[PDB]
Design a protein around this ligand. Structure first.
Ligand SMILES: COc1ccc(CC(=O)c2cc(Cl)c(O)cc2O)cc1
Length: 207
């Protein structure tokens, strides 16, 4: 297991997300679904010129998997996935420069719900999760698990568990007081409210 320090700006963003009073937590789901949609767009585009890139799975979709026993909500996509380098590099995002822009917007009347406009929506996961585990498989690499409970560090290891094929799973280990996000009716409500027109099928798994 390798342990890495977050860039200072990202550590600061995560503390802001964790510590700022902000009731509208439900937007985390919209942000993660948007990220999945972006990853699916990428593999779709690459597959246009090289169809073999779908050998690892032709279906382009998103699964939402609640598990009350483990207190987890998992967002799964069959998008492009991430290399080990991608994972370490802030999960393929421009998080350092994005955090700066986001910080400035906040000082200029922006609110936390606009986090996605700055390419750092992933970190909104920490509105509801005490720990986030990201399992990922890119065509060009092995399967990895990224993990962080904030506090300034994240880990990366190879993942020998259930091979995925291609894509990314974001596993939200929910805070004790945020279990509403495991209820079917609540998840449906949030998807309809914020993610109604996503261009890929979203399947909400049943318990
Ligand atoms: C904007 O283009 C990108 C496309 C894909 C990625 C990486 C990626 O696969 C991925 C990253 C995050 Cl955090 C996520 O919640 C879901 C994802 O599926 C990163 C950037």
């Amino acid at each position: 297991v390798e342990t890495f320090a977050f860039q200072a700006e990202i550590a600061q963003l995560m503390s802001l997300i964790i510590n700022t009073f902000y009731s509208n937590k439900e937007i985390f789901l919209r942000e993660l679904i948007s990220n999945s949609s972006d990853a699916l767009d990428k593999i779709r585009y690459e597959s246009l010129t090289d169809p073999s890139k779908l050998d690892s799975g032709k279906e382009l979709h998103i699964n939402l998997i609640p598990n009350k026993q483990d207190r987890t909500l998992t967002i799964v996509d069959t998008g492009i996935g991430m290399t080990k380098a991608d994972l370490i590099n802030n999960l393929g995002t421009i998080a350092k420069s994005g955090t700066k822009a986001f910080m400035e917007a906040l000082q200029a009347g922006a609110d936390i719900s606009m986090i996605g406009q700055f390419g750092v929506g992933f970190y909104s996961a920490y509105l509801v999760a005490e720990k986030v585990t990201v399992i990922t498989k890119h065509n060009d690499d092995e399967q990895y698990a990224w993990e962080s409970s904030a506090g300034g560090s994240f880990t990366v290891r190879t993942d020998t568990g259930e091979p995925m094929g291609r894509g990314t799973k974001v596993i939200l280990h929910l805070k004790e007081d945020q279990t509403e996000y495991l209820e079917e009716r609540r998840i449906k409500e949030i998807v309809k409210k914020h993610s109604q027109f996503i261009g890929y099928p979203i399947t909400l798994f049943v318990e």
